[PDB]
């Protein structure tokens, strides 16, 4: 696998799943293409859709990532995973219910620092989806 081959190999996965290649992963491809390749393989199996044989719905896969990005304080990822979840059918109500659970294990900052940024995005994106 050449690094051209690697970037092309994963293009459809990121476009489909995320609507694009996140900036972190662009830079990973740039400076660590073999790591990008292996990571992207892992990501592709982990985020497989139901149509492709997964048992956990894709909207709930990305909800889990939302919550994890809340905990880790990843405001870019959290919005990207919210968009992906909602594109896979997640409601804004489900999003909020999921994010709140983070308070049990990680305290009010699970909402207050980054988690709530997903909700702010969600209420605007919900309007856009409704317009489609």
């Amino acid at each position: 696998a050449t690094s051209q081959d690697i970037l092309k190999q994963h293009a459809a996965h990121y476009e489909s799943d995320m609507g694009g290649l996140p900036e972190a992963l662009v830079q990973l491809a740039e400076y660590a293409p073999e790591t990008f390749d292996a990571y992207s393989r892992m990501r592709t199996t982990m985020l497989k859709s139901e149509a492709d044989g997964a048992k956990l719905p894709l909207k709930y896969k990305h909800l889990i990532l939302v919550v994890l990005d809340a905990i880790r304080d990843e405001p870019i990822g959290i919005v990207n995973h919210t968009r992906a979840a909602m594109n896979a059918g997640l409601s804004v109500d489900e999003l909020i219910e999921g994010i709140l659970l983070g308070i049990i294990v990680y305290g009010m900052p699970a909402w207050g620092k980054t988690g709530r940024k997903a909700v702010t995005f969600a209420v605007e994106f919900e309007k856009e989806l409704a317009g489609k």
Copy 2:
């Protein structure tokens, strides 16, 4: 006392968790007003679909499983796995959810605590099948 507050929330914990975890027993003893407010918060957060929740209870507990994986809380991770599976989560779904922790939190998201949920789940799946029609 603590006795009345425990009585208030006993139905929630039996339904949701099959009982009150020891940490929360201790919290009830030493901080009964905190235990009461916390239990009220928990009760709303873990509301079932039948009581009007939008996110299925099995997935609520799966989120808690993954969070307990991250936090390295092995008692909680098994308690929430049990709860999730009681509410219909499959072992396959459990595994799929837990793996996602590796993306954000690395291999220890599986290796330290997450995998203990799976070890439990494989046995609990057979237990649950042997108790139900």
Copy 3:
């Protein structure tokens, strides 16, 4: 609605914090039952000595300052510094408390967020002196 639950806890937040932080405003909007239970928990935890608490309120908020230092919550760290100092904490005590984070959490316990509390405190000490006899 959210309106009634906000009314319920407004006296607590004005007294304790000088108002409701934006994160909790948002929580009240989107999760009013969670905001209510959480506010009840907070109210007991941050009880004053006058209402029967044993740990002085200034030290309660100092603990929250140090925790916000660890967690890197800069809005919260200033809010709790303000609260602590309103309740009588000195800038010297603030600094002594914050430093202890370095033992358990390394130099970032000061360098990232903790020191922002001190920067604020030096100015707030003069503000508080200019508003009081």
Copy 4:
């Protein structure tokens, strides 16, 4: 400062403050005496008593360390700092009030995993102190 000199120099501080040299710090002295020296200097200023010019009471210094050790999941440290706090005048009621605050910022595990172990110890140590 020889490594003999270093260990002797800090002996009174650890005996006074902690009732002993914690095992982690024994090993630090063993394998990293210059780091042990500098660290112990830092610790000695940070945990200075009121009699020696500190403004924050020693019992509340060690309470802050209790809470931090709850968060970090340091069950040895948490008991050592609880003992130190209580020896400096902290009540079991104050201890519990302080530990609970950890739930706000770090969730129920702030109590459930390690924090509550301080309380379990405290209720037994309180009996011992009362016996003195």
Copy 5:
């Protein structure tokens, strides 16, 4: 089955690099063979030796992972990575100097809870390597 093929595929890597497959990864291979495969590919490139074209010496790659396992409190990993680092030429002195640096960023617990366990192991393994 497919697990057994994938285990075979990565056995050379783990044998060479670690001397075995840690239990966590044995379980991963069983329950999530496609994740184990991709992860192992990723690890294989990350931990490439100088002889295979790496620029960072293998002993220092494993030293970095020792320090990371100290921070994360991975006591099995920390020993596995210490053993790997020393088989790759790392001295005990180097090991201690690197682990200490954790204290700057993560406080005394970077030593006290798991990091120092690597030193305890190292001092014994050194005697083993010295016995030839």
Copy 6:
């Protein structure tokens, strides 16, 4: 005052090792001069050069701190330590190989949030060092 004496006392260390005193430590010196003193003593031994008797090369000491600053999300520190590592002989290739290892223990955010910022800096600083 005593701050100014203690700053003078440690200036040689910081100038040599880091090329300056980070703002966080300037403030520490101002508000907590005795802590700054002891901390600086600790840092001075920890980051001793081979010429002064250290066994772990300075470039690798700073590489370890780069990785730790990636995990902790210290973007000022990560650049300061990258600069220090490269002034001590570390290559950009080595820097990237080490930062990637964070992903094993701490997930993609070990790269995505702060670690990759070191690479961005490094690639520019390399051009500077190459200009002599």
